[PDB]
Amino acid sequence: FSEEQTAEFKEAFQLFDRTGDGKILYSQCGDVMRALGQNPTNAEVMKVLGNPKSDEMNLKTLKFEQFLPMMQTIAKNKDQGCFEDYVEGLRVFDKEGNGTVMGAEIRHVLVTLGEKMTEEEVEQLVAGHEDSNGCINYEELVRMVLSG
Amino acid sequence: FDQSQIQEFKEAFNMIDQNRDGFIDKEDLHDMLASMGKNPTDEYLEGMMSEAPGPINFTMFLTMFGEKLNGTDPEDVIRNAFACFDEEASGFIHEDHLRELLTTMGDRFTDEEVDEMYREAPIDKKGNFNYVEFTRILKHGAK
Amino acid sequence: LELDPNLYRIGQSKIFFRTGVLAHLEEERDLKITDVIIAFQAQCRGYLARKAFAKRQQQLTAMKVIQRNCAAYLKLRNWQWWRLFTKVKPLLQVTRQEEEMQAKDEELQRTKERQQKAEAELKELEQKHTQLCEEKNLLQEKLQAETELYA
């Protein structure tokens, strides 16, 4: 990437230290990349960190110079998501073909399947988009995460 | 600096020159500092003129004063830096939260530095910390 | 799905299918579902993380702003040249109230001149409202009659 935006990435990297020795933990690494606009799976981040265990994730440290090629690897992926695929998977839970999924089902699927969110992560995501019947339009819910 | 600051500064210069002409020398400081209280040592009479790269006339003192007030931030920046820690509009950033922000979670001030900071900003001890009057004290307009 | 016509047959309500062929359209079922889930993968986490970051990525440079002022305060305060200014400006009020004494007793001369102006000015206005009582009726009388002459 150009030096222009690489200079911004230096400012953002310095804004995730909580101490002062200029190091970002392996545990923090995905959410630094997400701050800089990227949307990577946990298994995409983990792979570029060499597959560490949970214990050493809290103890292993990155500097900017070694964080920066990780940003360059995950920046060109071989795919990315859209709107067209993402509504199709949430429409399976649209009980009669309403255009709406029940807020309990949507909380339950994101926690139970795949990259398994916490109860907190789903509650923060869906709140205020579920109506008087507790029903969430999947169309605008996808637009909310994607467009930002 | 501002026009009001220039008038106060011009009157301060005119009461820190002690024999006039239109310069300030060692003796001007040594007599006046004795008159307004307890003088420092001669070391700090000498070390107060070697800040200035030329003779300590009104312009040189104004540059020396103005330059060493240049590297600071406007009060409104401080006001909307305090008012970035409150979520509710009762903008008193309470101690023992504000303590951690200075003593462990920022560029972390040592025990001496925090004692001076909370001595010249009234943590009463019984009355709680506060906000913008410890931005005015920090800048000028109070003490 | 370009199904071969030997693999299916079409009935009246149902589609008959050769052995295996349902289970491929089926595998698909486990496979198809477990990953296009699998997703939300970091679209939701990727949204939440940057929103949580921007609970202080508006704090970014306003912040720090406190600390470098606190750092400037102690080191401004405890360096020598400013220690003189710190006590001299409080003395300038005893002497900037001395400035205020000169301004005040000068103002007292202007202050009694306002009292002298105001009584005279009120009488001048009282006289000219008496006249402007007369002006309002006579100009109104003139204005009507002038229109009657125009007709």
Asked if A49 and A33 count as a contact pair (C-beta separation under 8 A), the reply is no
Residue A43 to residue C7: CA distance in whole angstroms: 39
CA separation for the pair C48, B41 (Å, rounded): 60
Distance from CA of A113 to the nearest CA of C (A): 6
Q: Kind and range of the H or E element at A32? A: helix A29-35
d(CA B70, CA B43): 27
**Alpha-carbon gap, residue C60 to B24, rounded angstroms:** 44
Residues 6+ apart with CB under 8 A from B93: B82, B85, B86, B101, B129, B130, B131
Between CA A32 and CA A27 the distance in angstroms is 10
The resolution, in Å, is 20.0
Nearest to A145 among C33, C36, C44 (CB): C44
Q: What SS3 state is found at A20? A: coil
Around Cβ C139, how many Cβ atoms within 10 Å? Answer: 9
> SS3 helix, strand, coil % of chain A, rounded to 5?
55, 5, 40
| Cα–Cα distance, B100 to C67 (Å, whole number) | 12
For every residue of C7-61, DSSP letters joined together read TEEE-SS-EEE-TTTTTTTSSHHHHHHHTTSS-SSSSHHHHHHHHHHTTSSSSSS
The DSSP line for chain B is: --HHHHHHHHHHHTTT-SS-TT---HHHHHHHHHHTS----HHHHHTTTSSSSS---HHHHHHHHHHTTTSS--HHHHHHHHTTS-SSS-----TTTHHHHHHTSSS---HHHHHHHHHTTT--SSSPP-STHHHHHHHSS--
**3-class DSSP assignment, residue A9:** helix
Per-residue burial over A22-42, b if 16 or more Cβ lie within 10 Å, else e, is ebbbbebbbbbbbbeebbbbe
Residues closing a segment before a gap in chain B (C–N exceeding 2.5 Å): none
Give the CA distances from residue C44 to residues A85, B103, C34, in Å, rounded to whole numbers and listed in that order. 15, 35, 17
What's A38's DSSP letter? -
SS3 A76: coil
Touching chains, C (3+ CB pairs < 8 A): A, B
Residue closest to B74 by CA, chosen among C54, C78, C61, C83: C61
The DSSP call for residue C142 is H
Closest by CA to B109, choosing from C82, C59, C66, is C66
Contact assessment for residue A87 and residue A138, using Cβ atoms and an 8 Å cutoff: yes
E runs forming strands in A10-60: 24-25
Q: Which of A37, A44, A125 sits opposite C44 (nearest CB)?
A: A125
Which of the 8 DSSP states describes residue A132? S
Q: Number of Cβ pairs closer than 8 Å across A and C?
A: 80
CA gap A106, A126 in Å, rounded: 8
Write the DSSP string, C90-135. Answer: HHTTTHHHHHHHHHHHHHHHHHHHHHHHHHHHHHHHHHHHHHHHHH
Neighboring chain C residues of B69 at a CB cutoff of 8 Å: 76
B8, B55, B59, B67, C79 from B63: Cα distances, Å: 15, 12, 6, 6, 16
C79 neighbourhood in chain B, CB within 8 Å: 68
- Pair B51, B3: CB distance under 8 Å: no
C41 contact residues in A (CB cutoff 8 A): 39, 41-42, 114-115
How many angstroms separate the CA atoms of B133 and B122, rounded?
10
Count of all residues that appear for chain B in the document: 143
- The DSSP string of A94-129 is -TTS-SEEEHHHHHHHHHHSTT---HHHHHHHHTTS
For tokens 């240049």, name the residue.
Answer: B70
Q: Which residues contact C36 (CB under 8 A, 6 or more apart)?
A: A85, A88, A89
- List of residues 6+ apart from A40 with CB closer than 8 A: A30, A33, A34, A74, A77, C42, C46
Which residues of chain C does A37 touch, with a Cβ-Cβ cutoff of 8 Å?
50
In Å, how far from its chain's centre is CA A63?
22
Q: Determine the residue among C28, C32, C40, C57 to mutate to test chain A binding: the one whose Cβ has the most chain A Cβ atoms within 10 Å.
A: C40
Answer whether A115 sits within 8 Å of C57, measured CB to CB: no
**Contact between A118 and A111 (Cβ < 8 Å):** yes
